[PDB]
C-alpha cells in the first residue's frame with residue numbers, strides 16, 4: 232500500500248474551491264488504470280478532509 | 284459579536300467606516316444573520332456554515 236503525494240495548488244495553479252469536481256486516472260505502463268473522482272464538499276470546516 | 288451576549292432588535296452592522304442599525308437598513312428582498320451561539324467560530328461573514336450546537 233503506497234501513497235502518492237500531489238501539490239495540487241501548484242499543479243492546477245490555484246487552490247481547489249468548494250463544490251468543485253476533480254477526476255482522473257493513474258495509468259500504468261500496462262494494465263487497468265486506477266480511477267479517481269471526487270467533488271469537494273460544500274463547507275470546508277477542518278484542516279484535513281476525507282475526500283474519499 | 285452577539286455570540287457573546289447582547290440585545291437582538293438593536294444590533295448594529297458595519298458599512299465600511301461606520302456602524303448603523305441592522306433591521307432598519309436591511310433591503311426589501313434580503314435577509315441578514317446574527318450569530319447567537321457558536322462554539323467553534325464556524326460562522327464567518329463571507330461563509331455562514333452552521334454545525335451541531
Ligand SMILES: [Ca+2]
Pocket residue numbers: 321322323324325326333334335
Ligand atoms: Ca459552529
